[PDB]
């Protein structure tokens, strides 16, 4: 199986990269959190 792992380890390391950004918001989410709620509202309004 090896002799391909460095190709495959990178092949799914990039996959982990493509989601690590949103995983930051998702690790510590608690309902009713005013800080996250208002920050999301502000960025949504700005992009709108």
Cβ proximity to a second copy: between 1 and 44 the closer is: 44
Cβ proximity to a second copy: between 10 and 38 the closer is: 38
Residue whose pair of structure tokens reads 């608690």 in the numeric block: 30
Residues lying near a second copy in the complex (CB under 8 A): 38, 42, 45-46
Start-to-end CA distance of the chain, whole Å, equals 49
Residue 28 CB, nearest approach to a second copy (Å): 20
Own/partner pairs for 3-12, CB < 8 Å, 24+ apart? none
Residue 42 CB, nearest approach to a second copy (Å): 5
């Amino acid at each position: 199986i090896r002799d391909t792992l460095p190709g495959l380890r990178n092949k799914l390391q990039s996959q982990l990269l493509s989601i690590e950004k949103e995983v930051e918001e998702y690790k510590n989410f608690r309902p009713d959190d005013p800080a996250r709620k208002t920050k999301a509202l502000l960025q949504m309004v700005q992009q709108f």
